[PDB]
Amino acid sequence: MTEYKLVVVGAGGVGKSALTIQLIQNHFVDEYDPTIEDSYRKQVVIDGETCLLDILDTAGCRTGEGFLCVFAINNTKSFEDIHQYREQIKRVKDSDDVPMVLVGNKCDLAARTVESRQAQDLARSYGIPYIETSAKTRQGVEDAFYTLVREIRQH
Ligand SMILES: Nc1nc2c(ncn2[C@@H]2O[C@H](COP(=O)(O)OP(=O)(O)NP(=O)(O)O)[C@@H](O)[C@H]2O)c(=O)[nH]1
Numbered sequence: 720m721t722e723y724k725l726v727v728v729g730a731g732g733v734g735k736s737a738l739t740i741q742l743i744q745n746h747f748v749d750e751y752d753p754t755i756e757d758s759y760r761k762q763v764v765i766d767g768e769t770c771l772l773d774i775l776d777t778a779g780c781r782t783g784e785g786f787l788c789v790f791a792i793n794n795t796k797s798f799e800d801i802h803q804y805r806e807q808i809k810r811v812k813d814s815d816d817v818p819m820v821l822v823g824n825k826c827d828l829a830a831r832t833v834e835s836r837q838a839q840d841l842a843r844s845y846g847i848p849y850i851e852t853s854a855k856t857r858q859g860v861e862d863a864f865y866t867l868v869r870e871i872r873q874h
């Protein structure tokens with residue numbers, strides 16, 4: 720079977736761990752336990768293909784096959800600093816064509832300081848898809864992770 724190595728990156732507190740745990744455990748973590756380094760695995764079916772998701776949850780290397788670049792829509796600075804994570808990845812992989820998805824998390828909150836059109840423009844300049852998610856309501860979570868898997872497939 721095929722295994723997909725996915726790496727979730729982004730600033731602190733944007734919800735990387737809540738996202739990974741919502742996908743894997745179908746459970747929203749209310750608390751904020753800072754991550755130093757964590758790894759999760761789960762067999763899922765994607766487009767009729769049984770595959771193993773291996774997800775590295777990082778704190779706010781070269782083995783990552785795809786990357787979720789996460790900011791929070793109510794955290795302007797986390798969006799302003801996403802370019803640092805993209806460029807870090809681009810450095811390590813030594814490729815301008817790295818499977819990647821731009822994720823705007825916490826889309827259930829009404830305190831939105833990052834406009835969707837702004838994130839769409841950024842994603843477009845990166846040549847990657849933009850997906851808004853909520854680890855709480857599960858909106859867009861499957862969309863984000865599975866879209867990243869499909870981006871790995873096209874590569
Ligand atoms: N309402 C809402 N709250 C969220 C969402 N995602 C995360 N949170 C909340 O925001 C906080 C941050 O969660 P967390 O996932 O740990 O962030 P993180 O990016 O992994 N932090 P670190 O880099 O420190 O490991 C938590 O209290 C969590 O409950 C979301 O989609 N909606």
Ligand SMILES: [Mg+2]
Pocket residue numbers: 735736737752753754776777778
């Ligand atoms: Mg975390």
